[PDB]
DNA sequence: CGGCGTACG
DNA sequence: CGTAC
DNA sequence: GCCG
């Protein structure tokens, strides 16, 4: 009744089991902070199953037969159904480890391994990190300086303004080039932690060398607070606000038009949706999927796709619009 | 038990 | 090591 | 942690 891969089922942005999925996602996050990738994936997948259900889970029997619910995930749900709280989840939430790893990994430039090393050195607060800049990269320095703004949700209102500004620079860098909104906003989210754009040009090959030209133009307009031949840029942008401005994370990616469907699919996400789709591709269909293409390793050939619809058809999956990829 | 997505900066 | 979905 |  419920297929086992998230790419086999529609997952809307808002759903009927918000509280249950949020709890499982706490345990998933905590597993990641400990390096337990398998447990992170199971808890993420169990959470996603609940997002795909057509109505609220009210009784434990409704978990019977659902993929990715075993003893542990089912006990979490049972406790939430019976008591409104799961003791394990609440213990994680208030733990010094969870709170500090979350605070540290939320920094742009800091991943689990860096956060964990700082944790073991006894560091606990952003001010702890500011006092020891000897230990910070230029990227991490930027992430820490801008941390407060970057912690403030980006709004869909902000996105339209940013896109016009990116389009202006893109059009000077390469007339005819296009800018497409991707990531969470393309899936219908009303706010986000960053804004994701995919850039291409209708004439194959004309996109070569494009992103340095775009970045130089944005920098000359005073709009770049931070950035690093390249085709992906992870920037911090200066975004107007009434009488002031705020820093916003923006990701720019260039793809040749031949690869655009694959890049659009990949950069539209969700992150879990894409991992599940690539796992499905490889394990169920024997095809290797990434944001550049879809490879048949028996015939040693790449599938040509003109659309995301083509890619779903290639993989034998019913098409899901971006708004239903919120796994 | 093995597997757990796959890229670029 | 970090980044992205 | 769960699937196959
Ligand atoms: Cl694990
Ligand atoms: Cl300004
Ligand atoms: Cl990729
Ligand atoms: Mg995003
Ligand atoms: Mg992004
Ligand atoms: Na980070």
Q: State in Å, rounded, how far the first CA of chain A is from the last one.
A: 17
Q: Give A220-223's long-range contacts (Cβ < 8 A, gap of 24+).
A: A221/A165, A221/A169, A223/A165
Would you say domain A153-257 falls under CATH 3.40.50.150? Answer: no
| Integer Cα distance of A319 and A238 in angstroms | 37
Is A251 catalytic? The answer is yes
Please give the C-alpha separations between residue A166 and each of A70, A245, A252, A281, A327, in angstroms, as whole numbers: 47, 17, 9, 34, 29
Considering only CA atoms, name the residue closest to the C1' of nucleotide B5: A275
Q: Report helix, strand or coil for A208.
A: coil
Smallest CA–C1' separation from A69, nucleotide: D2
Is A116 catalytic? The answer is no
* Of A116, A149, A158, A194, catalytic: A194
| Integer Cα distance of A188 and A27 in angstroms | 26
Deposited experimental method:
X-ray
| Integer Cα distance of A6 and A238 in angstroms | 36
Residues 6+ apart with CB under 8 A from A163: A179, A181, A195, A197
Pick A1-95's CATH classification: 3.60.40.10, 3.40.1000.10, 1.10.150.110, 3.40.50.1820: 1.10.150.110
Check if the beta carbon of residue A68 is closer than 8 Å to that of residue A26: no
CA A246 from centroid of its chain's CA atoms: 22
How many other C-beta atoms are found inside a 10 Å radius of the C-beta of residue A39? 16
A1-95 and A258-326 share one fold: no
Check if the beta carbon of residue A292 is closer than 8 Å to that of residue A305: no
Task: Report residue A65: phi and psi, to 5°.
Answer: 80, -5
Smallest CA–C1' separation from A39, nucleotide: D1
| Integer Cα distance of A48 and A65 in angstroms | 15
Q: Where are the domains of chain A?
A: 1-95, 96-152, 153-257, 258-326
Adjacent-strand bridge partners of A136: none
The total number of residues shown for chain A amounts to: 327
Would you say domain A258-326 falls under CATH 1.10.1660.10? Answer: no
CATH architecture of the region A96-152 = Orthogonal Bundle (1.10)
Ligand positioned closest to the Cα atom of A221:
2
Adjacent-strand bridge partners of A325: A11
A262 alpha carbon – ligand 3 mean position (Å): 9
Q: Kindly state the tokens that stand for A282.
A: 């490889």
For chain A, where are the alpha helices, taking DSSP H only?
Answer: 18-33, 37-52, 71-83, 87-94, 96-105, 112-120, 126-130, 138-145, 147-150, 156-173, 183-186, 210-220, 260-268, 271-285, 308-314
Residues 6+ apart with CB under 8 A from A55: A16
Residue A5: asked if its preceding bond is cis (omega within 30°), the reply is: no
| Integer Cα distance of A288 and A269 in angstroms | 17
- Which value, in Å, is the radius of gyration of the alpha carbons in chain A? 21
Q: Which of A4, A3, A9, A5 is nearest to A324 (CA)?
A: A9
How many other C-beta atoms are found inside a 10 Å radius of the C-beta of residue A261? 22
Q: Kindly state the tokens that stand for A248.
A: 């916003």
Q: Kindly state the tokens that stand for A244.
A: 């002031």
Q: Which of A315, A308, A318 is nearest to A259 (CA)?
A: A308
Check if the beta carbon of residue A315 is closer than 8 Å to that of residue A281: yes
Strand order in the sheet with A224-226: A178-181, A195-200, A244-254, A232-241, A224-226
Report the binding-site residues of A.
Answer: 194, 196, 251
Q: Report helix, strand or coil for A324.
A: helix
| Integer Cα distance of A312 and A179 in angstroms | 23
A100 alpha carbon – ligand 1 mean position (Å): 21
């Amino acid at each position: 009744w419920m297929p086992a891969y998230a790419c086999q089922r529609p997952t809307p942005l808002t759903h009927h089991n918000t509280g249950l999925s949020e709890a499982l996602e706490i345990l998933a996050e905590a597993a990641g902070f400990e390096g337990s990738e398998g447990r992170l994936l199971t808890f993420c997948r169990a959470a996603s199953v609940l997002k795909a259900l057509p109505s609220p889970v009210t009784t434990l029997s409704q978990l019977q037969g659902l993929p990715h619910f075993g003893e542990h995930s089912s006990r979490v749900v049972q406790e939430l159904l019976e008591h409104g709280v799961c003791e394990e989840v609440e213990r994680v939430r208030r733990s010094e480890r969870y709170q500090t790893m979350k605070l540290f990994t939320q920094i742009f430039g800091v991943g689990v391994k860096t956060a964990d090393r700082w944790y073991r050195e006894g560091l606990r607060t952003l001010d702890d990190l500011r006092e020891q800049p000897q230990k910070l990269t230029q990227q991490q320095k930027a992430g820490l300086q801008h941390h407060q703004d970057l912690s403030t949700p980006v709004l869909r209102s902000d996105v339209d303004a940013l896109q016009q500004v990116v389009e202006e620079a893109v059009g000077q860098a390469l007339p005819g080039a296009t800018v497409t909104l991707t990531g969470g906003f393309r899936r219908g989210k009303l706010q986000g932690h960053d804004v994701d754009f995919l850039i291409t040009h209708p004439k194959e090959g004309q996109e070569a060398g494009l992103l340095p030209r775009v970045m130089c133009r944005l920098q000359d307009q005073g709009l770049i607070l931070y950035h690093q031949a390249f085709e992906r840029s992870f920037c911090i942008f200066r975004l107007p606000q009434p009488g002031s401005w705020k820093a916003v994370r923006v990701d720019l990616v260039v793809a040749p038009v031949s690869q655009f469907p694959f890049a659009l699919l990949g950069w539209t996400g969700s992150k879990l949706f894409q991992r599940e789709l690539r796992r499905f591709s490889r394990k169920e269909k024997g095809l290797w999927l990434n944001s550049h293409g879809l490879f048949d390793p028996e015939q040693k050939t790449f599938f040509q796709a003109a659309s995301e619809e083509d890619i779903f058809r290639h993989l034998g999956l019913e098409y899901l619009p971006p708004e239903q990829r919120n796994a």
